[PDB]
Structure formats: C-alpha cells, structure tokens
A paper describes a structure:
As observed for other CRLs, the tethering of these two domains shows considerable heterogeneity. Using 3D classification, we identified multiple classes in which the Cul2 WHB domain and the Rbx1 RING domain adopt different conformations relative to one another. We focused our refinement on two classes that represent the extremes of the motion. State 1 represents a conformation in which the Cul2 WHB domain and the RING domain of Rbx1 are closely packed together and have reasonably well-resolved density. The close packing of these domains would sterically hinder the addition of a ubiquitin-like moiety called NEDD8 to the K689 residue of the Cul2 WHB domain. Neddylation stimulates E3 ubiquitin ligase activity and is necessary for CMG disassembly in Xenopus egg extracts. The RING domain of Rbx1 and the last domain of Cul2, a WHB domain, are tethered to the side of Cul2. CRL2Lrr1 is constructed around a canonical dimer of Cul2 and Rbx1. The N-terminus of Rbx1 contributes a central β-strand to the β-sheet of the Cul2 α/β-domain, explaining why these two proteins exist as an obligate complex. The nominal resolution of the best-resolved map is 3.1 Å.
When vertebrate replisomes from neighboring origins converge, the Mcm7 subunit of the replicative helicase, CMG, is ubiquitylated by the E3 ubiquitin ligase, CRL2Lrr1. CRL2Lrr1 has five subunits: a Cul2 scaffold, a RING domain-containing Rbx1 subunit that catalyzes ubiquitin transfer, a heterodimeric adaptor formed by Elongins B and C (EloBC), and a putative substrate-recognition subunit, Lrr1, that is linked to Cul2 via EloBC. The structures reveal that CRL2Lrr1 adopts an unusually open architecture, in which the putative substrate-recognition subunit, Lrr1, is located far from the catalytic module that catalyzes ubiquitin transfer. Our structure, coupled with bioinformatic analysis, revealed that X. laevis Lrr1 has four major domains: an N-terminal PH domain predicted by AlphaFold, a central LRR domain, a VHL box and a C-terminal treble cleft zinc finger.
Author numbering:
A (entry chain L): 134 to 415
B (entry chain B): 2 to 98
C (entry chain A): 2 to 745
D (entry chain R): 20 to 36, 40 to 56, 65 to 108
E (entry chain C): 15 to 112
The structure:
Amino acid sequence: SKLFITTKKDYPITKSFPYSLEHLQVSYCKLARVDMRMLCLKKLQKLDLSNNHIKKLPKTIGDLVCLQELILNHNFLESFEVVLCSTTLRDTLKSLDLSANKLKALPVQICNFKELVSLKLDENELLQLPFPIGQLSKLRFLSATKNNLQCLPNTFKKLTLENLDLFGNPFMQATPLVPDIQLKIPLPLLETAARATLKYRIPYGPHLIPATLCQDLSLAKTCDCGLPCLNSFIQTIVLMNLHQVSQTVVLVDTMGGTDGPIVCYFCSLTCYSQFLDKYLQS
Amino acid sequence: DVFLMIRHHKTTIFTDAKENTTVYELKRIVEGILKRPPEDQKLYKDDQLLDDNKTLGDCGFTSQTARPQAPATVGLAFRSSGDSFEPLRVEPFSSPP
Amino acid sequence: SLKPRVVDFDETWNKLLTTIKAVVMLDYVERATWNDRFSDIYALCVAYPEPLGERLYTETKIFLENHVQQLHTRVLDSAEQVLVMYFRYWEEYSRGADYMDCLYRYLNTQYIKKNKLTEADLQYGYGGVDMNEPLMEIGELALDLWRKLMIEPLQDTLLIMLLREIKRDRCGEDPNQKVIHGVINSFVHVEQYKKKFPLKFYQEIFESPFLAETGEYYKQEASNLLQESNCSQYMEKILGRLKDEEIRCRKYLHPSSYNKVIHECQQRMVADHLQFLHAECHNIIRQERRNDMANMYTLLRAVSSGLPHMIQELQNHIHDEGLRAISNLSQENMPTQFVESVLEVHSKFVQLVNCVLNGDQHFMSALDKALTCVVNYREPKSVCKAPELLAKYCDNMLKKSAKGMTENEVEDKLTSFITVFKYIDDKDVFQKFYARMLAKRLIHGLSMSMDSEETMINKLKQACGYEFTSKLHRMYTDMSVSADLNNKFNNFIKSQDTVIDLGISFQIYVLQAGAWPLTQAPSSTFAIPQELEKSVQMFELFYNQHFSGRKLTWLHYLCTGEVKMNYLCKPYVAMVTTYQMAVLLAFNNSEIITYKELQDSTQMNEKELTKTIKSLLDVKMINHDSDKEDIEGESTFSLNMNFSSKRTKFKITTPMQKDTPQEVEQTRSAVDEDRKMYLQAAIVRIMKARKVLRHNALIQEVISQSRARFNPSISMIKKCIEVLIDKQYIERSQASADEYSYVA
Amino acid sequence: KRFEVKKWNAVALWAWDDNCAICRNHIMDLCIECSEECTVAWGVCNHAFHFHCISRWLKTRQVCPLDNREWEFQKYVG
Amino acid sequence: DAMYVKLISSDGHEFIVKREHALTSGTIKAMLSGPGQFAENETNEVNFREIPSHVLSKVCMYFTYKVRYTNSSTEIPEFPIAPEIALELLMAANFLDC
Ligand SMILES: [Zn+2]
Ligand SMILES: [Zn+2]
Ligand SMILES: [Zn+2]
Ligand SMILES: [Zn+2]
C-alpha cells in the first residue's frame, strides 16, 4: 500500500510501479522532470516528490483520479503551468505544499482549486498570495513564511482557519489616510455594466461574454460597502487583526501584535468617507 | 437642463435644450441635421402636438423628467408632397431578451 | 450579433488580409470595410472554445515580416536611388503601421496588453504568461520588423548614401532636404515605442559615424583654411562655416544632436587651433581691430580656455594705455588732466567692451584691475600722488575761480569723478586731504553753493559708507548751525537785562573739535586787542549758559576783520587778519614803535610776528625807521605818511594757497598713524571673533576688511601684531610660535 | 582812539571739558569698540577715560595703570 | 453630420449623437480616424451592423451622460442598466472600450 524511494538506485529507471500501492513518496533524487510513467498510475492518494531537480510541472494530468495530497516541496519549480490548473485535479485535491521552492507568483487559476484544506508555500519568493484566495473556502492550513508578502489580498478576510504561519515577511506599513486614487468619474460603463452584471447575479459564461471580460468579472473586487467594482477603485493598505481570520496566529518578535496588511478596495469616492469616519471613530 | 431624443421613423437625434429653449431652436437643429426646411415638421409629445411659439418649459420637460441619462421622447413627422404630414410611425427599439 | 461564436480562420482572414494589405501600402479603402474589419478582428479575438488571438497575432506578424522583406528586396534591386525609395516606402509603411494600430486596437489593448504580465500584478495566468519572443503592439511590431528587416540589413548602405549627400551639401551643392530628413529621423521614429533610450538606435546608426565624419571633414577644412589665408579671414570663414553648419544641423538632423555636431565642429577648427588664435589676438586688441576682436570673442567663448588669455591681454593693453595717458601731463593742471585722462580711458574701453565684446563681466573685471593699477601708479622711491590729485581736482571744481560755470555741469563732472575715486586704493589719504581743503573752503567761503557740498558728502557716503565722511558731515553740520547761533547770539543781545554795545559787527563760526582738520598753534599766548574781550566774554557766558560742561577755544590764525581809513585823505577798506589788526591797533597809538613794544602789546611770539610784519611790508602799508635790510629785534616801524592802492577796497590777508610740502608730510604722518590704529582695531575685532586663529588667517582677514579704505602693507601689519602683543591683550601660543591666544 | 574796527569774523572751536591709555585714542573722540552713548569718566586720580574702555578694563583689574592705585569714578561727563 | 456622428445599428436605426460624445469610446475614435482623406461632406455613417439597436440606444445615452456629467462636482447618479440588457451592453462596452 505504501512505498518510498530515497535514492537513484531504488528508483526503477524503466519498469513501472505496482498497483497495490496507495501512497507514493519519492525523496532525494535527481529527477530533472516528472516522468510520464508515474502520471499513468490509477490510485495515487498522496504524491510526494520532495527534494528533486524538477523545473516544469507536467502540462496535463495523465490518468490520476484521486491525487488527494500532492507534495512538491524543496523543488526547483518556477511557475505552475496554466493548463495544469484547468484539469480535474481541483475536484479531488486536499493539500499542496511548495516549501523551499523558486516559485515567485502563484497563478490566479489556483482559485478554481476549491478543494484544498491545507496549503504550504514556505521559503518561496511569492510577491503576494493569489487574490481570489477567498474562493478556497475549505482551506484550513496556510503557510507562506520567509516570503515577501507586502500585502495580503482583499478576499483574505473571508477564509476561516485554525493556524497561520506568516512571520518573516516584509509587512508594508498601513496607510489608511493616504489613498491611491485610481477611481474615475464618470464611471466608464464597463465598470457600470460590470458592476451591474454582478449586482443582478446574471449567470454568464465564456460562451456568452467575450473571454477576456470573462476573466475580469471572475475576480472582480468586492468593496466593503457590499457592491462589486471591476475597476475604478480606491486601494487602501489597512492593517487588520488576523485572529478573526484564523484561530491561532504565529508571528516573530512581536508580543500582543498580530496586525496584518490587507488591500481594501473601495467602489466610489463617497463610499470611502464612510470608512474614514469609521476608522477615525475607532 | 434637459436632453431630447427625437425619434423620426428609423432615426434618432440627441439634442440638448434648456427649459427656456424655444421649439424653433429644435426645429432648426433638425433642419441642420436632416438638410430639410424647418417649417415642414411638427414636434410631438405622446400624440400631443407642440406649436412653434410656446417653449418647452410649459410642456412638462422638467429636469426631473428628461435627464441626460434617460432623455424624453419627442416625435417628429416630415412633409409629404403638398400640405400633408405623415403620422407618428415611430419604430420601437428592439426587444431585449 | 455580439456573441462568442465559432469562427473559421481562413474565411475572415482573407478579407482581413485584403484590408491590411490595402492599409499598410496606402491605397483606396472603404469606411464600411474598415468597420467590418473591426467587427472581424473582435470576432477572431474572442471565441469558444477556440480563441484566435494567438493565431491572428502570429499570422499578422508573418504577413508584416513578408511585406518588410519584399520592400527590402525591392529597394535593394534598385541602387543609386536607395534613399528616395527607402523614404517613400518608409512613410507609406509607418502610416500603415499607425493604421494597423488603430485597426488592431482591440488586439493591442485586450490581448497583447494582457499577456505581457511579468510579476504578480493581480493577473497571473489568463493568457500567454510563458513568454518567449515577447509580444509587442502591432503599431510597435511593424516598426520593429521594419528596423530588423529593412534598416539593419541596409545600415551600412544607408550611411554611405546619407554621408554622401550631407557632405555634398557641405561642398556647395543642394540635396533635397525632405528625403534626407525623413531617412535620418526614421531611426528616431522606429524606436518611438522604446521606454528607455529612444535615441539610442539613432545615436548608434547616424550620430557617432556622422560625428566622426564631420570631425574629419572639418579637420581637413581647417587645415586648408590655415594653409591658404591669415588669421582675420580665417575667423571670418570659421564663423561662416559654423553658421552654415548650425543651419544644416537644423535642416537634417534630430534636434537632440544640434549641440553635439557643433561641439565637434568648433573644436576641430577653433579648439584645435586656439594656440594659433591666442598667438595673434595680442596684435588684434592692441590695434584698431573691432570686427577682429568681436570674431575672436565669438570663437573663444565657445571653447573652455579661449577667454582667459584674451582677458589678460586686454588687461595688459588697458594698463599700458592708462600708464601712457597719465604720464604726459602738463605741470599747470595735474588734477583735471589726470581725472579727464582716466575718464577718457575708462569711457573708451567700456565702449569697447559693451560694443565689441558684448559687455562680458570678465572683461569688465580686467578693465577695473587695469585702471586700478593705472590710478595707483606710484613712481619708484615715492608715495602715491593720486589722492592728492583727486582732492585738488574736487577743490578746484568747488573753487570760485571757475567764472561763468553753472552747477549742472558741476554735478556732471562731480559724478564722473566718482568713477575715478572708486579706483583709489588709499582712500584715507584722499579723505584727509579733502577734509583739510574743504575746511579751508568753508572758513574762507570760496564755494559755489552749499548744495555742492550736499552733493559731495552724499556721493562720498554712497561710494564708501556713512562713517567714511561722517566727520565731514559733522563739520558740515557745524556750518548749518553756526549762523543759527549767530542769530541766537543776536537774540541774547536783545535778551540781556543790561544792554551793551559791542562796537563791532561780530560774526562767528562755531566748530566742533576733533572732527575738524584744524590744528591749534601750541601756546601762542596771543594778546587779544582791547576791543574784542567784551565780545569774547559775552560769547563765553552765552555758550556756558546754553551749553553745559563744554569749553571753547579761540583760534586766532583764521579770525579776520575790517579796518577802514577815512579821517586821512585816503579812504581805504582793508580786510585784515587778527594779528595784523592787533599790530595796526598798536601802531595807531604812537608814530614810532619798536619791536619790543610789539612783544609787549601782542604777546605773540617772534616767528609769527615777523611773518606778519613781512606780510605787512610786502604791500607797503608801513615804513621802516631802520636802514637795515633785515627785521631784527631792534627794528622800529612807523605808519605810512604817503600810502596808496589801485584796489581801494583791498585786503592785506594772505590769500589761501596750496598746502605747503611740509604740511603734506604731516598730513601723511597723521594718515599713517590713523592706519596703524585702524589695523589694531581690526586685529582686536578678529581676535574677539575667533580667540584662536592662524597668523595667515589674521593677515587675510585684516587685508580683506581693510581694503575698502586703504591697502596696508603687510609689514605695518606685523608691527601692529607686536604692538598688540606688547599690550598683553593676546599671547603667542606656547606650542606654536605662529599661533595666538586670548588671555586678556 | 579815533580809528576803530567795523567787522570781525571770529572762528571758534568747541569740545568737551588728551590720549587714552587704554584704547590709545583721543578722549573726546570715539573709542575703538564704539555708539553715541560713549561718554567720558573722570576719576579721583585726575584721569579722564572713555566709559567703554574703563568699563571693560575694570571687569578684571580694579586699579589704575597710571599710578597703580584703585580707580574710583569721581564723576561722569556725557 | 461632420459635427453629428450617425451610428447605424443592426436593425437599421440611425442614432445621431454629438461627435464629442461619440469620441468617449476610443474604438469609435479609431473607427472615424481610419482610412483618412475624408471628403468632409458632413456624412459620418458608422455601420455597427453587428450590435443590436436597443443597446446602441443605451450606448448613445451613456455617451451623453458621460460628456455632460464629466468635470462636475454635483451629485452624479448611477447610470441605469436594465437586468435584461446588461450583458449586451457589457460586450458592447467591450467592443466600444468605454
Ligand atoms: Zn463601496
Ligand atoms: Zn565707547
Ligand atoms: Zn590713575
Ligand atoms: Zn578709550
């Protein structure tokens, strides 16, 4: 049911693995690329390829049907392939660890991976977490330590977690009183139709809306007042307590301080003054 | 200030007018756009004929009613051969799903 | 209808390619077809499940590559016309590229600008994130493929053509401006989509080779010009060439190179031969060479080292001209001739600088230095005589001898004089000499009007501050109050309880001591004539009652009066001095009076008494009873029985003459003493400022702070140093003999 | 006697009531440091000095250098 | 019509709107600034053959709303979009870039 490969000699160069296995682990091997053969196996639940020389992940999953916990930490991955995100892997994944990897920007399509319950991205070079991380409502374990997370994304407040390891990152100082005015009045229509489409919960899809827009609306921002705004927003890097997001928070050299940056978006300039009044009173 | 959507047959003209604007100004605008003499046509408002002398203020073209974001409909009807004018055959805007 | 729909690539792309070929190679096309192509491009860009954005991009790039290759081959096939044909196809293709950018607006905006996403910019994925052969805008891509496939394969061919025509322009021929300019700015135009260094391609293709070729051509031109002609028309031709070259640079090149070219054009025929020009400008400025001087200035102001040699040469010329002008003055009129010669030199050279050398500040500084050296020109083993000359000039202009001379030209000459006076290094000597001569003018009343001295004091105050002439002004104020006190005295004459008759038309001048340059004769013990003691005593009590804690001294070498002779057959008005008045008062008592009686009566000493007697006998008012040719102690005198004078209303007072030489050395000794005190005070001031300062710093500070009035010799500065040291105000530093410290 | 004088243009010089031993300047003249408040001071030792000079001298030395005797301000003339 | 731009939709409706109102959408700006060398006979017909007329009406009304309520400090109200018409306008806004 279980097997482990820890050296080049123990790794079958030509012959394939048996089928009685349930868990597969490959560690400390000079695998330049993930083999085509290992993608043809039937019942892999947990797949580990720790400490290898893998640069590019396979384009498409060959035949895997469960692939519950895929672990690829301590690897040489640069960026996930876009086509790999769109396969059936989202329907059954449970975990994904990319610790100690040269990954620099998680692709946004990882929002479609709704089935994760534990994510690990430690010791990476992640500029910021994927913006629609709110879509991962089932996620429970998140770790991106030793990264450069200048600002967590807006949807981060949606997730409910148990622990959150994030100490060791450059946290930009909050600037609630200094906005970055990207808003334009009159709201060009596309922000206005767009604000409308989402307001009316008009089911749409790429077969009905031209594809590029179909991307923009999928990840359209949500202002604090409760209405979407595809563009023409006010961005404020505001610190919020992270105990609401996760039950337990771990930080470094800070006792009693758990604040974290969040890029709050604002639909309209008049809507910003309400938040300023709220912050001044609080 | 009010904005007007003149609807003649298969045509629609967007104009700007004030509550004190005279109807002859609208008639001259239509003259310029459609290169036809002004006295031919008569503007309309829901089958209620509108005359030249009186201005739009007494019609009902208030700011709260005819906004730029949703102009009020004003009919139009040109001149046939002689002294006969066509009725208000205003083509409605196609049905959205 | 607007909808994501399946689209066959070939059916739309045939019409799209037809329109694109129509627009890139500008020909007739319908507006409706343009609208339909917008619709077709939108339909291709978005579809389901097969987007055609990538395929459309690749196919339009391939078509652009093929078109640029076809144009390149067509241009290569026709030689000796590469420039004209290249420019024609260039303008056609560039406008076509703009038209594609407009027509592919959706492609550029929502396909290309969404794949070029490098970092985690809120949009990772959703496009061709894996970027090899990076995507570029169609308007940008067309020009990029134009430079890659039409410019570079032709680079070496273009320049050899371009440099052939531009050089042909410089040889007197007239190539067409439009084609050359278009080809040249094509290199800038192509890289117009580059964020960094848009001109880098232009610089590397047609700036550095062009700069080098210009350098070589103008080096050869300068060599030919030097070999064929002399200096003057060499500057003429260089100026003509530089003007024509700026014209050509604006005519052909990019504006950003406008400076660079001329930098390589003047440095090859001016800076490479500034030795030739500098070795000839000396003969230019020292002669009537106006246009040559202007051309020299224009040439040498461009290069770095052109100016200072000309500046120094002009300073030398001005200094020599001033020395030659002020060394040939006639003995009669040293002051006015000196001032007018200095003003003539100054005016001529200021006109030269403002009319030929554009009034450059450096040339003004050179003029000022040269005239400063000329003004303070002192003969060997002699002291500077300029301050004396200026004081004499001012006095003469303020003297009554200038008959029929109004005051407006007085002001004109008097404000011209300030230009010369500003060049005086030793202003203290002039100040003291003018103080003495102005005091003489005021006492003797030989001025135009008092507004003239208004102007003098005001001008000198403007030139050297208020403290420079403050004492003078104080002296001036005495005048302004003296008459008042006189009138005030008259009031007291009408205010005394016991009215008395003075028997004299008493007039006085009340002068403040110290501020006036008048020296009292030590212990003259002159006996006042019996008449004047009343006036003296009432004036003293007047002054004591109106001024408290003040004493008044009566100087008798300037007080004068009048004696009238009526009772004899010869009525004569005689303006007389105090001593002479006392002498005549004595002689009126007895017909024959001996010298011992003069001592008994006048009580004033032998030297001044015999001077008065000599003055009296000079105009022959009294007779000598002794045949001795010398006035001894036994001489006896009598009044003249037979006296006459053509001037009936005459004066026996000695006229005020120039200051005797003895007087000028006492004045200079006083000036030197004042200089020593001023340097002492300045040294004390600086020591208070620092309390620690290097001796050289003391020297620099004192020379800087004292040059406004006089230029002290450094030797006098040393003597001031040990004078202060002996006063126990400062100490010589134990660790450093050249350092001073405060212990006072 | 019968002969008299009809005019007399006198000239007079007025000053205070000669060279300082401190500032080496004329007593009636202005001192080195000075500005119109520089009056003069007469002491018991029959010495007249500038007010500023004697004031700055007495700040450390309380004796008159001329006679090596303590200086006492007899009066001030201003 | 060199000052009044005329837009012909799929149904044949001719919506005549101010040219400065039409230039709000950059696509139309390119549409008019296409081939060039226009005769300037006061005839600007831009056949939007592939968009419905009932949505081109809202597009023109938005053009007027945007040009009128730009550079204004008044309380600008939300442009009304019917639920049955939002998408056609969105895709149309996409094709119009406005
Ligand atoms: Zn809001
Ligand atoms: Zn003082
Ligand atoms: Zn004493
Ligand atoms: Zn003193």
